[PDB]
Amino acid sequence: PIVQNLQGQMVHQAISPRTLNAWVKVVEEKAFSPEVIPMFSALSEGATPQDLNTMLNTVGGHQAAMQMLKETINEEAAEWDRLHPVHAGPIAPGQMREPRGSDIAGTTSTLQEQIGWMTHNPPIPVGEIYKRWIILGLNKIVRMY
Ligand SMILES: [Cl-]
Ligand SMILES: [Zn+2]
Ligand SMILES: [Zn+2]
């Protein structure tokens, strides 16, 4: 995740193993219940797309629900791309590129790119956008049961 230190410096840290452990245990008890959503949010403050994927990867042992979630992510990512069809290059040399849907979902962007977006002034909040897609997904799974 990205944390802000006392000087206002945004600093990246790798995801906590204790965070992953708590997430797996949460899902063991509440996988199909509405509380899985605020617990996901509780455990992902400042999370990068890469963090979010690492979290999903640990609960990968659910198959059908995870397929549903991956479908919702792909849907939302398509939708992002339709609203923001990528240009051939950035506005000028030195500028970050605009994220595509797969950049937000962390499958075609590097952690360095994610950090660059998230620490922009003001933030290009790719972790929060992805979290929204994941939550929409978790919501469908709990509705479905
Ligand atoms: Cl990376
Ligand atoms: Zn452009
Ligand atoms: Zn800018």
UniProtKB/Swiss-Prot annotation:
Free-text description of this protein's post-translational modifications in UniProt: Phosphorylated possibly by host MAPK1; this phosphorylation is necessary for Pin1-mediated virion uncoating.
Parts forming coiled coils: none
Subcellular location: Virion
Site residues, Cis/trans isomerization of proline peptide bond: G89, P90
Cleaved signal peptide residues: none
Region annotation Interaction with human PPIA/CYPA and NUP153: where it falls in the sequence: 57-95
Modified residues (Phosphoserine): S16
Domain of life from the UniProt record: Viruses
Quaternary context: Homodimer; the homodimer further multimerizes as homohexamers or homopentamers. Interacts with human PPIA/CYPA; This interaction stabilizes the capsid. Interacts with human NUP153. Interacts with host PDZD8; this interaction stabilizes the capsid. Interacts with monkey TRIM5; this interaction destabilizes the capsid.
Function: Forms the conical core that encapsulates the genomic RNA-nucleocapsid complex in the virion. Most core are conical, with only 7% tubular. The core is constituted by capsid protein hexamer subunits. The core is disassembled soon after virion entry. Host restriction factors such as TRIM5-alpha or TRIMCyp bind retroviral capsids and cause premature capsid disassembly, leading to blocks in reverse transcription. Capsid restriction by TRIM5 is one of the factors which restricts HIV-1 to the human species. Host PIN1 apparently facilitates the virion uncoating.
Protein name as it appears in the record: Capsid protein p24
Species for this entry: Human immunodeficiency virus type 1 group M subtype B (isolate NY5) (HIV-1)
Residue range from the parent sequence: 133 to 277 of 1435
